[PDB]
Amino acid sequence: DWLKERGLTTVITAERGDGALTRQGLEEYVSDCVILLDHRVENQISTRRLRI
Amino acid sequence: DHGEPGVFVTFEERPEDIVNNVASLGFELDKLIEEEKIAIEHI
């Protein structure tokens, strides 16, 4: 809210780890736009995929 | 449409965030907010 008040566009980086969409599991509910990045191995080839 | 006024309670985002969210849908919430046809409370 301090950044928002000052009129600043914020971007944050978080980790998943074992699972879920965030490490803590709840930062997704304390943001406005969540994007998930993946580097999944199918068979033996990896295809990087991004989701909104 | 159905003539039943409403109240909104938000425990996360500020009311202006919801207002801007629905701005694109043509819902035009601020109009209702100040017309007292709907209410908002931020906690």
3-state SS, B4-28, equals CCEEEEECCCCHHHHHHHHHCCCCC
Secondary structure of chain A: what % helix, strand, coil (to 5)? Answer: 15, 25, 60
Q: Do the strands A45-51 and A36-42 form a parallel or antiparallel pair, or are they unpaired?
A: antiparallel
Q: How many CB atoms are located within 10 Å of the residue B29 CB?
A: 19
> Does the beta-carbon distance from A30 to B17 stay under 8 Å?
no
Residue labelled with tokens 């978080």? A14
> Does the beta-carbon distance from B12 to A30 stay under 8 Å?
yes
Token pair for B32:
């209702």
Resolution in angstroms comes to: 3.5
Token pair for A30:
């304390």
| A5 touches B at CB < 8 Å | no
This entry's atomic model was obtained through X-ray
Q: Which residues of chain B make contact with A3, given a CB cutoff of 8 A?
A: none
> Does the beta-carbon distance from A29 to B17 stay under 8 Å?
no
